[PDB]
Structure 1
Amino acid sequence: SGNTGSIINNYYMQQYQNSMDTQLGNDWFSKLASSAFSGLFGALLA
């Protein structure tokens, strides 16, 4: 995900090298930028 160049598996368990995430129960800004209006608001001529 970040800057990592190893094509082989990390020697240490995923549980050590990193902190383990948990769950409960570009996300916003890319979903915002994808809705940008590229059109023309008025009638086109020629």
Structure 2
Amino acid sequence: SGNTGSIINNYYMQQYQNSMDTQLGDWFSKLASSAFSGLFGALLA
């Protein structure tokens, strides 16, 4: 969530604290998890 460390709720609501984001109608975690491993040829023990 960030560098917060409070278990209590915030005093100011949500919109006097941050700037509200708006939807309209991530990558490198998908890129680093599709990494090839193992070998390329027939391995032995």
TM-score > 0.5, shorter chain as reference: yes
- Count the aligned residue pairs: 45
SS of the equivalent of 1:29 reads helix
Which ranges of structure 1 fall in alignment gaps of 5 or more residues? none
User: Which structure: greater helix fraction?
Assistant: 1
> Take 2:44 and 2:18, find their aligned partners in 1: how far apart are those partners?
59
Give the percent of matched residue pairs that are identical in Structure 1 and Structure 2.
Answer: 100
Measured against aligned partners, the alpha-carbon deviations of 1:14-33 in whole angstroms (never above 9, x if no partner) come to 011000000111x0000000
After TM superposition, give the deviation of residue 45 of structure 1 in Å: 1.1
